């Protein structure tokens, strides 16, 4: 009824928002700064207080000390090296050698110790964040879930049942099978359930251009790993990071093997990782090096194969629990139609079988819609199917 009367009384106050919010001050869209209404702590005091008494305190690196006296030996980025001193504010206790310290530009004396270098590409592969994958969602391989989970979390959640019994729990475990079987998807439930540092590693990210370059990245990874008390290190697709040593004639695949040898050394030998648990997963395990496959590094050895019948029916009940369907279908018929089949294929059949109901104008799929999925996904894509030379893992 009041067509313009709602529109302009709308519009003059939608504008009058901005017409006084410019008179507040949010404006002068910047080049990298902050809101003018926020910074006013450093306004009259820290502008000459966090600035004018404050130094630059250029950071350095300690070489070593000497006896009887401080007479410290400093080192900087490019320039020369000095004999330097502490400040009074610090003890000479935590002034150990090979340490970064904040140092004045004039007297060249030590102010505060610093943490060492972390190499932030290693920092990036800390995940910081958990996925949503439930152990309810990897149903069908519950014995593998149990046999893994009894290794992964049970000392971390209960470090007393192993101690008072008097056994040290294992540290290493690989997971392997054909692709799409639930290896990576299974790892996501661990990264879900967990709490500590979950540092993921994909081996092809270690492929470097320089020599020894990934090998130091390994070292740093174990440095910040040894900083944390308990830490879980994830290894995905480790066939890139190493099969074995086979060298003959011109040195082929030399560079990868040395990093693999560093990975051996960081795993076993001379006061090791302690409370750092590892977890590999491959596709084809047959390529892998035997000393890598030595226990003490890769103790638990979990297989992932296809489910028998009931795990498959359970996977039907996993992906199929949340879709509009005919009420009176049965899945055991479909599992009979899927002998050699992964749960990814089961999910793909679920998602295609919905699309059949999406084809004309149906809301819920039927049994024969599922049958329309079966021949296409199973039997029409049967030229590809990707599995059988991975069943033998070649």
């Amino acid at each position: 009824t009041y067509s313009r009367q709602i529109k302009q009384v709308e519009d003059d106050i939608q504008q009058l928002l901005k017409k006084i919010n410019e008179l507040t001050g949010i404006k002068e869209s910047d080049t990298g700064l902050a809101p003018p209404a926020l910074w006013d702590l450093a306004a009259d005091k820290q502008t000459l207080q966090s600035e004018q008494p404050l130094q630059v305190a250029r950071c350095t690196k300690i070489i070593n000390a000497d006896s009887e006296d401080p007479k410290y030996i400093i080192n900087v980025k490019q320039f020369a090296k000095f004999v330097v001193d502490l400040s009074d504010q610090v003890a000479p206790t935590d002034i150990e050698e090979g340490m970064r310290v904040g140092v004045d530009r004039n007297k060249y004396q030590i102010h505060i110790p610093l943490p060492p270098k972390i190499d932030p590409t290693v920092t990036m592969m800390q995940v910081e964040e958990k996925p949503d994958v439930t152990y309810s969602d990897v149903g069908g391989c519950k014995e593998q879930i149990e046999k893994l989970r009894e290794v992964v979390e049970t000392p971390l959640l209960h470090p007393e049942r192993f101690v008072n019994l008097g056994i040290e729990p294992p540290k290493g475990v690989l997971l392997f099978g054909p692709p799409g079987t639930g290896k990576t998807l299974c790892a996501r439930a661990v990264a879900n359930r967990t709490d500590a540092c979950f540092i993921r590693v994909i081996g092809s990210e270690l492929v470097q251009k320089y020599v020894g370059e990934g090998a130091r990245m390994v070292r740093e990874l174990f440095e910040m790993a040894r900083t944390k008390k308990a830490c879980l290190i994830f290894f995905d697709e480790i066939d890139a990071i190493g099969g074995a040593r086979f060298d003959d004639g011109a040195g082929g695949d030399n560079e990868v093997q040395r990093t693999m040898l560093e990975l051996i050394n960081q795993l076993d030998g001379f006061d090791p990782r302690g409370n750092i648990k590892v977890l590999m997963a491959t596709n084809r395990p047959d390529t892998l090096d035997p000393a890598l496959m030595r226990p003490g590094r890769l103790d638990r050895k979990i297989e992932f194969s296809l489910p028998d019948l009931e795990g498959r029916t359970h996977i039907f009940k996993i992906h199929a629990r949340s879709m509009s369907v005919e009420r009176d279908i049965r899945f055991e018929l479909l599992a009979r139609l899927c002998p050699n089949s992964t749960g990814a294929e089961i999910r793909s059949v679920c998602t295609e079988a919905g699309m059949f109901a999406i084809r004309a104008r149906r809301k819920i799929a039927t049994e024969k819609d599922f049958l329309e999925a079966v021949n296409k996904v199973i039997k029409s894509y049967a030229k590809f199917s990707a599995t059988p030379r991975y069943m033998t893992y070649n």
Binding site: E28, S29, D30, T31
Partner: protein, 49 residues
């Protein structure tokens, strides 16, 4: 003019730079030959276009 050269030549040297591009509030981003980039100002006698 000629006596003035004894004085004005006491002025120090002038840097040479390289514009990447300008930003807001009469400022530009300029990098030296082998020396890092700077966000600096303009004088009044220089137009932004």
């Amino acid at each position: 003019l000629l006596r003035e050269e004894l004085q004005l030549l006491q002025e120090q040297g002038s840097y040479v730079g390289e514009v990447v591009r300008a930003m807001d509030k009469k400022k530009v981003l300029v990098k030296v030959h082998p020396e890092g980039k700077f966000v600096v100002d303009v004088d009044k006698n220089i137009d932004i276009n």
